[PDB]
Amino acid sequence: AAPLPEGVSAEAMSSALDRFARIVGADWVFTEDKITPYEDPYTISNDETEHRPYAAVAPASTEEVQEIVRVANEFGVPLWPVSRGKNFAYGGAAPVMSGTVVLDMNRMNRILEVNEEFGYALVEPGVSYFELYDYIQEKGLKLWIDVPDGGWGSVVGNALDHGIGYTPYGDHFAMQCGMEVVLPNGEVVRTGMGAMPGNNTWQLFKYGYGPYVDGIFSQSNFGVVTKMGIWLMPEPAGYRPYLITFENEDDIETVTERLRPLKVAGVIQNGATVRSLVLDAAITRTKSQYYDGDGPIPPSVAKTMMADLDLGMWNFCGALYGPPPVMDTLWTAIRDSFADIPGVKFYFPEDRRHKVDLLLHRAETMKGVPKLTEFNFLNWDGGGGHVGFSPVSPITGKDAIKQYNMVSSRVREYGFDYMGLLAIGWRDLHHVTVIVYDKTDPDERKKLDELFNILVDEAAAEGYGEYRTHIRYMDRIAKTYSWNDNALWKMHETIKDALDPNGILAPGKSGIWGKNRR
Amino acid sequence: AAPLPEGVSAEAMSSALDRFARIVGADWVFTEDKITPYEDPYTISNDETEHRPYAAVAPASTEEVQEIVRVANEFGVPLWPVSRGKNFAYGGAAPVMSGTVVLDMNRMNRILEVNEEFGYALVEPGVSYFELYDYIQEKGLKLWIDVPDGGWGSVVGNALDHGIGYTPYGDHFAMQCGMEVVLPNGEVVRTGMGAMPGNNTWQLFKYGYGPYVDGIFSQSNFGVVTKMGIWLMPEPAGYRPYLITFENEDDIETVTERLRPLKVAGVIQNGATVRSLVLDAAITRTKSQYYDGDGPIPPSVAKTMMADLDLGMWNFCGALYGPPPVMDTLWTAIRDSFADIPGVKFYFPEDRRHKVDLLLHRAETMKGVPKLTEFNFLNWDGGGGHVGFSPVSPITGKDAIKQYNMVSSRVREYGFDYMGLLAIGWRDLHHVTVIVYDKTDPDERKKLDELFNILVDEAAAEGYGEYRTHIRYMDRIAKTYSWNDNALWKMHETIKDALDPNGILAPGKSGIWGKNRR
Ligand SMILES: Cc1cc2nc3c(=O)[nH]c(=O)nc-3n(C[C@H](O)[C@H](O)[C@H](O)COP(=O)(O)OP(=O)(O)OC[C@H]3O[C@@H](n4cnc5c(N)ncnc54)[C@H](O)[C@@H]3O)c2cc1C
Ligand SMILES: Cc1cc2nc3c(=O)[nH]c(=O)nc-3n(C[C@H](O)[C@H](O)[C@H](O)COP(=O)(O)OP(=O)(O)OC[C@H]3O[C@@H](n4cnc5c(N)ncnc54)[C@H](O)[C@@H]3O)c2cc1C
């Protein structure tokens, strides 16, 4: 079973569960066997006392949330809010500290507004990418959404976690506009213009007046977000996805050099993604279809996969947006930036000879169509879980290839296949390492945990820091931001103790604890 | 003279001034007659005990700032930070509360970095738009800056106040990336990746890890910003400014309807500005050159000015950016959106027959060239000060014209000329009212103060709220954001008391006081 959270009497916990049950009704308080949906689905720990949720409560309304939060204060019980809790590779729905009651906000799934003239939506945390896409299609509205690679997750939760997608609206939190928040004391606030009664501008103007605070409720335990606005891209007048491939692994140095001017200037309109061979292949193939051995793939097999699949060692999947004349012009600039590189190949969808193909999968993603089929890389090695590591770096060939060499060697010494991606947002490069592992085998869990720790350690030392991580690694990633004896987190701790003096909101999120657990 | 701030002994103040003088050296502590630079230059109050600064201290370094702040705590003296304090129409350098020691950061004017590959700058608060433009030109770097209408002011201070400009980088705070902050206790923090020692990514990636807090130091008294990064637009491959004019005052309803789709989609790349006749004329003419009477201008004079100056009743000044093919395409969409409106006229600079002309002034602004000559509207009526009122509204003809009728009537009943502007950022319309008044005449001060109060009152009631205001009106503008008995400001007060328990930072900025003055 799961243990009580330290400092919390068994009487006080059962008093809390009863008063929660009055608030949401007895049907919506979960214990015992009902609680396995809220486990980490991709186990990393070998210790079964860690990241174990104790109960779940699922309110219907903002006001029920406040009532819980007030109760949680009275009995000093901690809560762990999830919008839908489909945060795979980050912990799923599970809390950092054991003993935590999960506040599940699935049921709060109303789409309050979708406005076509102004290109926005106002949504509760329960609304998924699938629900929002389907609503938009059904009503015939000319708006695109921006989806991660799995659309069963939360428009809100993903944005609060600094999620990304693959359209020009790829920076989810950046497109957030207006929120309603239940503070850790149980008071309700609205940010920006929503603080102004009678406004029709909540989702039109981010700032409102005075200190801009939306951001303090992202990657945070300073409040529970119960409503959130997000800007939506008007349907454009044109759309052309492409794939550029490169033959050699060393190609990533010059390729990254040429993306810099294109990205900084905005000639490329979405995030640029340059994916390694195995990461792309694993969408439509598995390792055992190409190699017998338990080890990572030898070079000769890599060549086979390249020739079969029409993929390079690096694969740049992008998309043009806008009227055909603009697209033609941007394409001339993009293509010309890469033409002189030996081995380079350029494809539009018509030129892909396979009808089950990387480019045809990612054409859907790059126009905001949510889909299940990215999760296919999970099957590369017979079926397991994934871990991601995605630190930030300057957009430089030299930083690109250093990260590639550093990571690929260690991943491969550990017997995993190198699956990596060079992503660029706007001025920021991320080298994303994804490691598929057997979540059911404790010997591979020990291996993966150690590998992850080392990668983080070696990346930080070169200046590369993580921006989003798994519940398990939250403290570790916090300790990377340590300038002036951890001055930043001390300020976080100061705000935490002011908004949450009893520390009853997600103790340990982003490595923020509060005075009682510190 | 100026009075001591309430609650502060005369001994304690002179102890503070001495220990400040040890910190920055005696040359850099200002009293008595040295203190008139830091008065409000555009007097609104008739009471000479209000917004009166008591002393000024001008440190050299971040560490001097911290020392002051620690001293300020010991003796409970309040500080009012200005970067350069050239905040005209908002109070200049003056504090809301009297008695406040001005912390002047002019001397901290080093440009720490300008990076061409990555399109950013790292600047101290003392750096003006003029200094940054001149540095960029001198070193030959292909970067544009984004300037307000007066470039003698602070890249930092303007961004912290939510300032705007007229290029695609018009949203200044939005382009902010990374800051160093001295907290009200005197500790120093860096946000985002700057918290990570050895980073080369401080100005490349906004968020870093965990709660995003940059925004809490804008329009705020939660800290003193001592360094700040800002993204800079790479020099584009082309640039074509334009002016579209319209004959009738009612034209602003359809004009605003057609801008909506263009702005939401981003076809117009900079903020759209549609300026009333007098606001544009006053750049190159004065009232007395057209009309004798003390009143506002009659219609017959308006017609004269239109025919002389080749200006309409509304004037849409915009600019295309990028390679000629993209510009041609965007122009076709823009022009076609307006062609069917009776009286419409379209001009590029070549088609302006005057060599001292609105379009040739604003061509400079819309490519990031700082210039003095906007301040010319100040001379319309013989020379005075300005007040601005710029609330937010949905991008709607109906909201545009309601605001026009509401404001123009009252401004004109009060004997001022209607000078207004319809601006659009991205999804946000602002009706900006600018009122030029005689700052030296107390009867016109009473009039302007009353008018301003009424405008605010009538605009709020229709859903339109102010986002930036004069020191004098800060409390009033705060009280507009009152949903749930002022729940938002109560949270601001909570964070204020946690970061600033002794309340020694800009008491009253954005209507935030702290527990000792509340
Ligand atoms: C194969 C694979 C591919 C993926 N691809 C992508 C991708 O392309 N892009 C991407 O962004 N992600 C991606 N992810 C991660 C994940 O799938 C999505 O980000 C997912 O949408 C997040 O889960 P969710 O939306 O349910 O958010 P939630 O689980 O609801 O929220 C995530 C976290 O945010 C916090 N939180 C949530 N709601 C609130 C609230 N109301 N108040 C306060 N805090 C709150 C909590 O701490 C929670 O743990 C991928 C994962 C896998 C395994
Ligand atoms: C005719 C006219 C035209 C104008 N046109 C424009 C325009 O086009 N666009 C525009 O944006 N503005 C415009 N303004 C307003 C003003 O000219 C500029 O915004 C100006 O640059 C702001 O003053 P500053 O840059 O010195 O900032 P400061 O005076 O240094 O700062 C403004 C405020 O920010 C806060 N602050 C400053 N530095 C710090 C710090 N380090 N830490 C904490 N708080 C701090 C303070 O409360 C200060 O009062 C105009 C004004 C006039 C009169």
Give me the residue from B209, B326, B490 closest to A467, CB to CB.
B209
Give me the residue from A191, A483, A494 closest to B196, CB to CB.
A483
Task: State yes or no: is A38 an active-site residue.
Answer: no
Burial (Cβ within 10 Å: 0-12, 13-18, ≥19) of residue A221: buried
CB neighbours of B40 closer than 8 A, spacing ≥ 6? Answer: B51, B91, B92, B94, B471, B472
CATH of region B481-518 = 1.10.45.10
Say if the Cβ atoms of B220 and A197 lie within 8 Å: no
Distance from residue A150's CA to the centre of ligand 1 (Å): 10
Interface with chain A: mutation pick from B182, B193, B256, B431, highest number of A CBs within 10 Å? B193
Q: Where are the beta strands (DSSP E) in B366-510?
A: 385-389, 392-394, 420-424, 428-437
CB neighbours of B57 closer than 8 A, spacing ≥ 6? Answer: B20, B23, B24, B28, B29, B30, B68, B79, B101, B102, B103, B104
What six digits make up the tokens of A105?
């906000």
* Distance (Å, whole) CA A517 – CA A125: 28
Please give the full DSSP string across A288-338, using - where no structure is assigned: GGT--SSSPPPHHHHHHHHHHHT--SEEEEEEEESSHHHHHHHHHHHHHHH
- Comparing CA positions, the residue from B119, B141, B267, B367 lying closest to residue A262 is B119
A441 to A363, A383, B235, B289, B349: CA distances (angstroms)? 36, 12, 55, 88, 72
CB neighbours of A15 closer than 8 A, spacing ≥ 6? Answer: A75
Residues of chain A with CATH 3.30.465.10: 111-234
Number of C-beta neighbours around residue A515 at 10 A = 13
Give chain A's end-to-end CA distance (angstroms, integer).
26
| Residue B352, SS3 per DSSP | coil
Which of A90, A120, A347, A418 is flagged as catalytic? A90
What six digits make up the tokens of A16?
């809390």
Which of B90, B120, B242, B437 is flagged as catalytic? B90
- Comparing CA positions, the residue from A486, B132, B184, B225 lying closest to residue A511 is A486
Q: What are phi and psi of A408, to 5 degrees?
A: -50, -45
Rounded (to 5) percent helix, strand, coil in chain B: 40, 20, 45
- Comparing CA positions, the residue from B184, B180, B182 lying closest to residue B193 is B180
CB neighbours of B413 closer than 8 A, spacing ≥ 6? Answer: none
CB A413 within 8 A of CB A250: no
Residues of A with Cβ-Cβ distance to B236 under 8 angstroms: 265
CB A458 within 8 A of CB A406: yes
Within B226-323, residue ranges assigned H as helices are 251-265, 277-281, 299-309
* Distance (Å, whole) CA B308 – CA A495: 60
Q: Which amino acid makes up residue B68?
A: I
* Distance (Å, whole) CA B239 – CA B511: 42
Give me the half-sphere count of Cα atoms (radius 13 Å) on the Cβ side of residue A212: 23
Fold of the CATH domain A10-106: 3.30.43
* Distance (Å, whole) CA B430 – CA B256: 11
Say if the Cβ atoms of A264 and B234 lie within 8 Å: yes
Q: Which amino acid makes up residue B131?
A: E
DSSP letter (8 states) at residue A365: H
| Atom of ligand 1 minimally distant from the CA of A471 | 49
- Comparing CA positions, the residue from B20, B24, B33 lying closest to residue B77 is B20
Distance from residue A500's CA to the centre of ligand 1 (Å): 24
A71 to A15, A16, A17, A62, B92: CA distances (angstroms)? 9, 7, 9, 14, 48
CA A157 to chain centre: 9
| Atom of ligand 2 minimally distant from the CA of B224 | 42
- Comparing CA positions, the residue from B261, B218, B219, B277 lying closest to residue B420 is B277
Number of C-beta neighbours around residue A26 at 10 A = 9
CB B446 within 8 A of CB B406: no
Distance from residue B126's CA to the centre of ligand 2 (Å): 12
CB neighbours of B208 closer than 8 A, spacing ≥ 6? Answer: A465, A467, A481, B191, B192, B193, B194, B195, B196
Give me the residue from A213, A481, A490 closest to B196, CB to CB.
A481
Query: Is the dihedral angle over the CA atoms A252, A255, A261, A265 positive or is it negative?
Result: negative
**Pick among 3.40.50.150, 1.10.287.110, 3.30.930.10, 3.30.465.10: CATH of B111-234:** 3.30.465.10
CB B234 within 8 A of CB B142: yes
Known binding-site residue numbers of B for FAD: 80, 83-88, 149, 152, 154, 158, 164, 166, 225, 386, 468, 509
Beta carbon of A473 within 6 Å of any ligand 1 atom: no
Distance from residue A158's CA to the centre of ligand 1 (Å): 4
CB neighbours of A501 closer than 8 A, spacing ≥ 6? Answer: A514, A515
Number of C-beta neighbours around residue B247 at 10 A = 16
* Distance (Å, whole) CA B154 – CA B177: 16
CB neighbours of A14 closer than 8 A, spacing ≥ 6? Answer: none
Which of B418, B468, B472, B473 is flagged as catalytic? B468
Say if the Cβ atoms of B207 and A467 lie within 8 Å: yes
* Distance (Å, whole) CA A11 – CA A388: 40
Q: Which amino acid makes up residue A248?
A: N
Say if the Cβ atoms of B483 and A197 lie within 8 Å: yes
Residue labelled with tokens 């190198």? A418
Q: Where are the beta strands (DSSP E) in B195-289?
A: 224-231, 233-234, 239-246, 272-276
Query: Is the dihedral angle over the CA atoms B350, B353, B356, B361 positive or is it negative?
Result: negative
CB A289 within 8 A of CB A305: no
Q: Which amino acid makes up residue A517?
A: R
CB neighbours of B20 closer than 8 A, spacing ≥ 6? Answer: B29, B57, B68, B71, B101
In this structure, chain A runs to a length of 518
Between β-strands A55-57 and A101-104, what pairing exists: parallel, antiparallel or unpaired? parallel
CB A362 within 8 A of CB A371: no
Say if the Cβ atoms of B484 and A212 lie within 8 Å: no
Q: Interior CA angle at B497 toward B495 and B501, to 5°? A: 140
Known binding-site residue numbers of A: 80, 83-88, 149, 152, 154, 158, 164, 166, 225, 386, 468, 509
B152 to A254, B33, B130, B469: CA distances (angstroms)? 42, 23, 6, 19
- Chain A residue with the nearest C-alpha to that of B236: A265
- Comparing CA positions, the residue from A182, A160, A157 lying closest to residue A63 is A182
CB A508 within 8 A of CB A475: yes
Task: State yes or no: is B90 an active-site residue.
Answer: yes
* Distance (Å, whole) CA B129 – CA B293: 39
* Distance (Å, whole) CA A113 – CA A108: 14
Q: Which amino acid makes up residue A92?
A: G
CB neighbours of A185 closer than 8 A, spacing ≥ 6? Answer: A69, A70, A73, A499, A500
* Distance (Å, whole) CA A374 – CA A377: 7
Within A48-117, residue ranges assigned H as helices are 62-74
CB neighbours of B386 closer than 8 A, spacing ≥ 6? Answer: B42, B88, B89, B377, B378, B434, B435, B436, B437
Task: State yes or no: is B107 an active-site residue.
Answer: no
CB A391 within 8 A of CB A269: no
Distance from CA of A381 to the nearest CA of B (A): 32
DSSP letter (8 states) at residue A353: -
Number of C-beta neighbours around residue A1 at 10 A = 8
DSSP letter (8 states) at residue A283: T
- Chain B residue with the nearest C-alpha to that of A206: B428
> Mutation test of ligand 1: which of A147, A161, A387 has the most ligand atoms closer than 8 Å to its C-beta?
A161
Which of A207, A209, A212, A467 is flagged as catalytic? A467
* Distance (Å, whole) CA B264 – CA B395: 9
| Residue B424, SS3 per DSSP | strand
Say if the Cβ atoms of A218 and B195 lie within 8 Å: no
Residues of A with Cβ-Cβ distance to B468 under 8 angstroms: 209
Residue labelled with tokens 């694969």? A315
Residues of B with Cβ-Cβ distance to A495 under 8 angstroms: 211, 495, 498-499
CB A248 within 8 A of CB A344: no
Between β-strands B143-144 and B79-82, what pairing exists: parallel, antiparallel or unpaired? unpaired
What six digits make up the tokens of A420?
């990596």
Number of C-beta neighbours around residue A40 at 10 A = 24
Distance from CA of B223 to the nearest CA of A (A): 11
CB B301 within 8 A of CB B291: yes
Within A205-286, residue ranges assigned H as helices are 251-265, 277-281
CB A284 within 8 A of CB A308: no
CB A275 within 8 A of CB A245: no
Say if the Cβ atoms of A119 and B427 lie within 8 Å: yes
Distance from residue A29's CA to the centre of ligand 1 (Å): 23
Residues of chain B with CATH 1.10.45.10: 481-518
Experimental method reported for this structure: X-ray
Q: Determine which residue's CA is closest to atom 42 belonging to ligand 1.
A: A224
Tell me chain B's radius of gyration from C-alpha atoms. Answer: 23
| Residue B241, SS3 per DSSP | strand
Q: What's domain A239-468's superfamily in CATH?
A: FAD-linked oxidases, C-terminal domain (3.40.462.10)
Which of A190, A275, A362, A468 is flagged as catalytic? A468
A197 to A217, A270, B100, B479: CA distances (angstroms)? 22, 36, 33, 11
Q: Which amino acid makes up residue B320?
A: L
Distance from CA of A408 to the nearest CA of B (A): 22
Which of the ligands is closest to the CA of residue B167?
2
Instruction: Name the packing angle between helices A397-413 and A251-265 (round to 10°).
Output: 130
DSSP letter (8 states) at residue B202: T
Residue labelled with tokens 């890469």? A338
Known binding-site residue numbers of A for FAD: 80, 83-88, 149, 152, 154, 158, 164, 166, 225, 386, 468, 509
Give me the residue from A209, A212, A490 closest to B215, CB to CB.
A212
Write B441-449 long-range contacts (CB < 8 A, 24+).
B442/B46, B445/B43, B445/B44, B445/B45, B445/B46, B446/B46, B447/B414, B447/B415, B448/B44, B448/B387, B448/B414, B448/B416, B449/B44, B449/B45
Residues of A with Cβ-Cβ distance to B480 under 8 angstroms: 196, 209
Give me the half-sphere count of Cα atoms (radius 13 Å) on the Cβ side of residue A181: 26
Give chain B's end-to-end CA distance (angstroms, integer).
26
DSSP letter (8 states) at residue A153: S
Which of the ligands is closest to the CA of residue B275?
2
Burial (Cβ within 10 Å: 0-12, 13-18, ≥19) of residue B414: middle
Which of the ligands is closest to the CA of residue A469?
1
User: How would you write B35-77 as a 3-class SS string?
Assistant: HHHHCCCCCCCCCCCCCCCCEEECCCCHHHHHHHHHHHHHCCC
CB B309 within 8 A of CB B281: yes
* Distance (Å, whole) CA B47 – CA A324: 63
B184 to A280, B14, B497: CA distances (angstroms)? 51, 21, 10
Residues of B with Cβ-Cβ distance to A218 under 8 angstroms: 207, 211-212
Burial (Cβ within 10 Å: 0-12, 13-18, ≥19) of residue A9: exposed
What six digits make up the tokens of B2?
């100026």
CB neighbours of A278 closer than 8 A, spacing ≥ 6? Answer: A297, A305, A380, A417, A418, A419
Tell me chain A's radius of gyration from C-alpha atoms. Answer: 23
For the B239-472 domain, the top CATH level (class) is alpha beta
